[PDB]
Write an enzyme that holds these catalytic residues in place. Sequence first.
Site, PDB file in Angstrom:
ATOM      1  N   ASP A 181       0.849  -1.229   0.000  1.00  0.00           N
ATOM      2  CA  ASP A 181       0.000   0.000   0.000  1.00  0.00           C
ATOM      3  C   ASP A 181       0.874   1.266   0.000  1.00  0.00           C
ATOM      4  OD1 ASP A 181      -2.485  -1.404  -0.002  1.00  0.00           O
ATOM      5  OD2 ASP A 181      -3.162  -0.482   1.926  1.00  0.00           O
ATOM      6  N   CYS A 215      -2.523   0.426 -13.501  1.00  0.00           N
ATOM      7  CA  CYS A 215      -2.563   0.445 -12.013  1.00  0.00           C
ATOM      8  C   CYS A 215      -3.793   1.261 -11.644  1.00  0.00           C
ATOM      9  CB  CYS A 215      -1.209   0.850 -11.416  1.00  0.00           C
ATOM     10  SG  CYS A 215      -0.421   2.323 -12.181  1.00  0.00           S
ATOM     11  N   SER A 216      -3.725   2.195 -10.691  1.00  0.00           N
ATOM     12  CA  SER A 216      -4.874   3.105 -10.514  1.00  0.00           C
ATOM     13  C   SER A 216      -4.837   4.254 -11.533  1.00  0.00           C
ATOM     14  CB  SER A 216      -4.932   3.610  -9.063  1.00  0.00           C
ATOM     15  OG  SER A 216      -6.208   4.196  -8.838  1.00  0.00           O
ATOM     16  N   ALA A 217      -3.745   5.024 -11.601  1.00  0.00           N
ATOM     17  CA  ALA A 217      -3.639   6.164 -12.571  1.00  0.00           C
ATOM     18  C   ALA A 217      -2.987   5.720 -13.893  1.00  0.00           C
ATOM     19  CB  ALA A 217      -2.842   7.296 -11.972  1.00  0.00           C
ATOM     20  N   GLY A 218      -2.320   4.575 -13.913  1.00  0.00           N
ATOM     21  CA  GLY A 218      -1.593   4.101 -15.112  1.00  0.00           C
ATOM     22  C   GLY A 218      -0.291   4.846 -15.418  1.00  0.00           C
ATOM     23  N   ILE A 219       0.430   5.345 -14.434  1.00  0.00           N
ATOM     24  CA  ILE A 219       1.737   6.057 -14.681  1.00  0.00           C
ATOM     25  C   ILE A 219       2.841   5.571 -13.749  1.00  0.00           C
ATOM     26  CG2 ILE A 219       0.626   8.046 -15.741  1.00  0.00           C
ATOM     27  CD1 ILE A 219       0.952   9.599 -13.164  1.00  0.00           C
ATOM     28  N   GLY A 220       2.525   5.154 -12.522  1.00  0.00           N
ATOM     29  CA  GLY A 220       3.549   4.862 -11.511  1.00  0.00           C
ATOM     30  C   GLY A 220       4.069   3.431 -11.556  1.00  0.00           C
ATOM     31  N   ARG A 221       3.367   2.472 -10.929  1.00  0.00           N
ATOM     32  CA  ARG A 221       3.684   1.034 -11.087  1.00  0.00           C
ATOM     33  C   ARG A 221       3.738   0.656 -12.567  1.00  0.00           C
ATOM     34  NH1 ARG A 221      -0.466  -1.080  -6.302  1.00  0.00           N
ATOM     35  NH2 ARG A 221       0.234   0.513  -4.787  1.00  0.00           N
ATOM     36  N   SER A 222       2.784   1.131 -13.352  1.00  0.00           N
ATOM     37  CA  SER A 222       2.676   0.812 -14.798  1.00  0.00           C
ATOM     38  C   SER A 222       3.951   1.279 -15.506  1.00  0.00           C
ATOM     39  CB  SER A 222       1.456   1.480 -15.426  1.00  0.00           C
ATOM     40  OG  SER A 222       0.202   0.896 -14.999  1.00  0.00           O
ATOM     41  N   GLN A 262       6.356   7.854 -10.506  1.00  0.00           N
ATOM     42  CA  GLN A 262       5.633   8.904  -9.707  1.00  0.00           C
ATOM     43  C   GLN A 262       6.478   9.402  -8.537  1.00  0.00           C
ATOM     44  OE1 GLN A 262       1.649   6.793  -9.339  1.00  0.00           O
ATOM     45  NE2 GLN A 262       0.954   8.916  -9.324  1.00  0.00           N
TER      46      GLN A 262
END
EC number: 3.1.3.48
Length: 284
Positions: A181, A215-222, A262
């Site tokens: 998290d 992911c949630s926003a599609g920029i960080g983990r993605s 991010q």
Amino acid sequence: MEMEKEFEQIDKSGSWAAIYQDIRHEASDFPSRVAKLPKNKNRNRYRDVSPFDHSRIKLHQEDNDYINASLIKMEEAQRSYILTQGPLPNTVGHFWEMVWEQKSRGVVMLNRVMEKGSLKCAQYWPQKEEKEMIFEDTNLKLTLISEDIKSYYTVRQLELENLTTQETREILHFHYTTWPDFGVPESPASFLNFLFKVRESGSLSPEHGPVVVHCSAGIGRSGTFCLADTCLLLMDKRKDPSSVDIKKVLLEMRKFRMGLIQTADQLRFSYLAVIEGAKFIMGD
Ligand SMILES: CC(C)N1C[C@@H](O)c2ccccc2S1(=O)=O
């Protein structure tokens, strides 16, 4: 400069925040006018995360062609990715329309439906074989075929039917279920194992449309997933693997979607994953 020495130099100097801000400063700025039209407000999860107009995926429909999704095309690596937000309650039908239209073989999901006590994306796939999903707005049916639950990730076989033509395709769902998290994983071993399972499936290969990654926003983990995959593929292809510059690859990918990676911790984790993964690529 061998990235492993660049890594130790930044770590000993504790300058990750400085390197990361330099990337933020040099990153491309392109228009996102379609994303900001009033008709599209309920198609965006986050007001500050939008696809550029030049690289956005268009839905094949005259009504409204908009989805929050970008085509990342890596010319030298010969890999393409679609990076997208977690689907919203009113965009689950659009999401599966895009998978169908772009001829993708795989969906890579790097978040849980609930994290930090809040919903990070819609429950957009069926949880039981005998309870299929119908998307009336886009005329698609989605059925769960099988599920393989492992310690770090789950793989699902899904059947997508175009109800208009009665054509069907097998889609593979790769769900990384253990990203914490807060912060990033302590070791990249489970994330690299996961990346190698997606590769072994055929989902990233040129005989298929581009993999869908979210992911949630599609920029960080993605961003971390595609950056690690592309850097390892370039180290395989080139005469001089030490010529691969992770910062330059990230800035190339940021020409196609804003905000990829991010945090400074996500930048450090991407370096760790590529350094540890190269100890396979180079013959081990
Ligand atoms: C034409 C062949 C290589 N395919 C590519 C792609 O269109 C696709 C996407 C999802 C499921 C299956 C297939 S596919 O095997 O039919």
